[PDB]
Design a protein around this ligand. Structure first.
Ligand SMILES: [Cl-]
Ligand SMILES: [Cl-]
Ligand SMILES: [Cl-]
Lengths: 269, 270
């Protein structure tokens, strides 16, 4: 079941531009004890996406009410919100386009995160790159065919997550997560001005690493820098953070970065 | 607004469908003339290639042809749009244990503006929006079209009719909803589409005709200066089917030599 523009309803008009063009964006939030973690950041990300995609959306107050009412009742859950431009327009044009569409649903929190969080996971280099486009960089928009292909190629291997480059060979993110790596006292993360999703958990870790025993650099790096790192971690709003135990044959034992961030992230707020 | 979804006349689709979640599929848009679908075989072929390239299992090709031809008969003119998506299911981006693929068909009216475009020629403008480079999606009319939505949006802040579109490295690739050819002297150029853009049904048809022609043909990797300096530019897609460019970047383009050779083949129902 789904809540579409305030109506309990599990079907959407075929003409909707999410279906036609992936014309919209979304966020995925973790539910803990009936409350939505980082609820204000999730609304923020959706607002920034709507603005950058020129999707007029009026019911921010109403959407906040709907999200919190759906979360109450679930001790452990996943709330997904989609905002599309709606139906209408002539081809790709959005002139005379009807009002936007909001789509909310609560799903089950996966259990495999706990096993991942304890033992660490393996990374493999995805052959699928990310297209570079600063008009879409950072946004968790609906055009996610690249991640679908990345996940498909990843499933042909024994690795749990993929290291994903952009079209010019620069480390950008993982398949469904942002990534940080550490060498010594310096923590690195890829700059996302050209591709990738500027995640809520990524923005949260940067806000805490700004007062920490680590230096922080947003970099433009080749995959060698990841292979030569002391420690790698990945993060998204759900995991919320997972360490990397192996990548490209070399083993990663250190947990220094993970142990600093874990108490911040895994406090669900 | 009524569609044929998996053979059933409906106006709604399950929200779980991965077309709605991720743009997980592809489409094609075909012209109808006198109840016949133009280039019908080429449209089934493009959908087939896209499904294979996106790893979407789809076995109902004969059923789909019958549904296409059924919705098209009796329409003197029309536009037939077909979407094939991976369907519903899977965990996140993963497609394992994914339910049956979805097919979506609809017929709408043929726009009258193509005729006045065809007669008077249109204007081009350089789009500030680039196309991401990715050889695993290049050439496919997949559903991840947000780039084309932004291009048209920025185009609507100008006076031009169509946009010249570059990829992220600055190479001429296509227009907003069409492929493009240009000519200098006896040589006809068109961008190679191995990194981005849609390898259109009509681009492919023109390339076949140009192999029996008084023109040399080259698929190139070119900068926008090559377009601005050409003698002639045309654009094409399944519906137009071929439109001449009369103006770009203040330059006037008067010759129609390439347009006059391709138009008799294109403006013939196949
Ligand atoms: Cl996610
Ligand atoms: Cl192709
Ligand atoms: Cl089109």
């Amino acid at each position: 079941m789904f809540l579409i523009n305030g109506h309990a309803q599990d079907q959407l008009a075929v003409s909707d531009r999410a279906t036609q063009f992936g014309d919209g964006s979304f966020t995925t939030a973790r539910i803990v004890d009936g409350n939505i973690c980082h609820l204000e950041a999730h609304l923020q990300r959706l607002q920034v996406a709507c603005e950058k995609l020129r999707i007029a959306f009026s019911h921010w107050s109403t959407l906040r009410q709907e999200m919190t009412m759906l979360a109450t009742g679930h001790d452990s859950g996943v709330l997904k919100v989609i905002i599309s431009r709606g139906s209408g327009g002539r081809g790709y044009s959005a002139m005379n386009c009807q009002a936007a569409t909001r789509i909310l649903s609560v799903s089950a929190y996966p259990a495999y995160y706990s096993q991942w969080r304890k033992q660490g996971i393996t990374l493999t280099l995805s052959p699928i790159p990310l297209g570079r486009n600063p008009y879409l960089a950072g946004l968790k928009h609906l055009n996610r065919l690249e991640q679908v292909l990345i996940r498909s190629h990843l499933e042909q291997t024994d690795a749990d997550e993929a290291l994903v480059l952009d079209s010019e060979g620069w480390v950008t993110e993982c398949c469904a997560a942002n990534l940080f790596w550490r060498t010594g006292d310096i923590v690195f993360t890829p700059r996302l001005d050209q591709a990738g999703v500027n995640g809520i958990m990524r923005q949260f870790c940067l806000r805490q690493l700004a007062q920490s025993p680590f230096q922080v650099l947003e970099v433009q790096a080749r995959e060698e820098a990841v292979r030569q790192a002391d420690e790698i971690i990945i993060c998204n709003a759900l995991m919320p953070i997972i360490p990397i135990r192996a990548y490209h044959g070399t083993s990663y034992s250190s947990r220094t970065l993970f142990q600093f961030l874990a108490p911040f992230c895994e406090h669900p707020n």
